[PDB]
């Protein structure tokens, strides 16, 4: 397959033209947005990946799996702070979803950082959430 | 007339250009909005979110139900939530009366012979014969019961 810069180049251009055709006709079909982001990571170019996710949110934000994978896409490259700000935008966009709060917790427990998880459960309780929040706190 | 011709030679034609419903492209429209206006209701009887595949596939049930109604097939889907089935029956009754009603109106346009188009005739014979047979089988069944 690939030889040098120039071949890699053509191999990219072709893919991007193809996909974004297929996204051009379906704004929806989230899976497509995901896969295209995934390819974008495998090219070791993040900036584009960030965007591609963001666009994918501007279409639909209620679709959590995209939130999640746009987290893990930030973590698996071992860049955290992005995966924090993203979390503030996440739970703030959707407080009623547990999966976001729990995932942001685990992100702060595997980092051992407590001060957070204290103030964190302080919020996630302050909204009078439900039985499982208190129980887990 | 020319004023336009030359603003189009400079400024190019317009990109959006909506268009309008009209004589020819009518049914497609009527259909298209019908389908959409099922998909609201059936999207709101379902508990939460699950949509895309469930949706499309339910519409396929729509068409199938219609073209049953034509052929006079009684159409019972083996197992499927009652309310949904209610919705489909509701609409397909609605479309039904659109159809039969238009069949009368047009036939009584032809009998006068007042500017009915060509195919409109052939079609309307279709819609008739269908209706006539349904009357037939009805009349027999009640002759049993």
């Amino acid at each position: 397959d690939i030889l040098d810069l120039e071949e890699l180049r053509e191999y990219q251009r072709r893919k991007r033209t193809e996909y974004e055709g297929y996204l051009k006709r379906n704004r929806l079909d989230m899976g497509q947005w995901i896969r295209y982001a995934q390819f974008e990571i495998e090219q070791h170019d993040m900036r584009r990946a960030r965007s591609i996710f963001e666009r994918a949110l501007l279409v639909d934000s209620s679709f959590i799996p995209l939130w999640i994978r746009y987290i893990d896409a930030e973590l698996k490259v071992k860049c955290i702070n992005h995966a924090r700000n993203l979390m503030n935008r996440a739970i703030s966009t959707l407080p009623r979803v547990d999966k976001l709060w729990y995932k942001y917790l685990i992100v702060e427990e595997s980092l051992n950082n407590v001060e957070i998880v204290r103030s964190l459960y302080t919020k996630w309780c302050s909204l009078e959430p439900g039985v499982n929040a208190w129980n887990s706190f | 007339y020319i004023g336009n011709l030359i603003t189009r030679q400079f400024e190019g034609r317009s990109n959006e250009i909506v268009k309008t419903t009209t004589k020819q492209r009518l049914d497609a429209y009527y259909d298209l909005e019908l389908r959409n206006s099922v998909m609201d209701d059936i999207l709101e009887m379902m508990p939460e979110s699950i949509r895309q595949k469930k949706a499309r596939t339910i519409l396929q049930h729509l068409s199938e139900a219609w073209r049953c109604w034509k052929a006079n097939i009684p159409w019972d889907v083996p197992g499927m939530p009652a309310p949904i089935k209610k919705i489909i029956e509701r609409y397909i009754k609605s479309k039904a009366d659109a159809w039969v009603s238009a069949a009368h109106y047009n036939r009584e346009r032809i009998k006068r012979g007042a500017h009915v188009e060509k195919t409109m005739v052939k079609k309307n014979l279709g819609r008739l014969t269908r209706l006539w047979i349904k009357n037939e089988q009805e009349r027999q069944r009640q002759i049993q019961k």
């Binding site: - | 999207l43 209610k86 509701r90």
Partner: protein, 146 residues
């Protein structure tokens, strides 16, 4: 301002003809909202009777809401208390699905109700004067945890 609460499509609204606020239905839960601030104001006690096709407010603070299950549901406006329900006798030869309610409005006096129904007919509802308390009362006010 956006008011995001409702859970799925928001299918109907109406304007209080006095109070300057707007009832917004939803599928199964019918809130009100204040203008100017875009407050919340109230939350009408409604189990899932929905799908709510329509709302109609009134001069006396009655509220109407039409179901597609074929049930008229009237409320007080101030409260949330639902003080009457009605199965709308569908029709002669109809199909049980064809009982539903596709619109509503109140005449300018506030005392007469007009609705259309998927069974090809209009019905007009009247406000029965006997009432008072005599044996009037409705469902009797046990506000619950929403």
């Amino acid at each position: 301002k956006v008011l995001t609460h409702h859970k799925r499509s928001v299918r109907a609204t109406a304007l209080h003809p006095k109070e300057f606020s707007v009832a917004s239905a939803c599928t199964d839960d019918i809130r009100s909202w204040g203008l100017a601030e875009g407050s919340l104001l109230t939350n009408f006690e409604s189990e899932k009777t929905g799908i709510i096709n329509t709302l109609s407010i009134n001069q006396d603070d009655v509220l109407f809401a039409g179901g597609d299950n074929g049930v008229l549901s009237f409320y007080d406006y101030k409260s949330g208390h639902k003080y009457q329900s009605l199965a709308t006798r569908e029709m002669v030869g109809s199909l049980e699905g064809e009982r539903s309610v596709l619109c509503s409005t109140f005449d300018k006096t506030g005392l007469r109700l007009i609705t259309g129904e998927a069974d090809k007919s209009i019905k007009i509802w009247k406000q029965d004067e006997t009432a008072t308390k005599e044996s009037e009362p409705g469902l009797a006010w046990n506000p619950n945890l929403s």
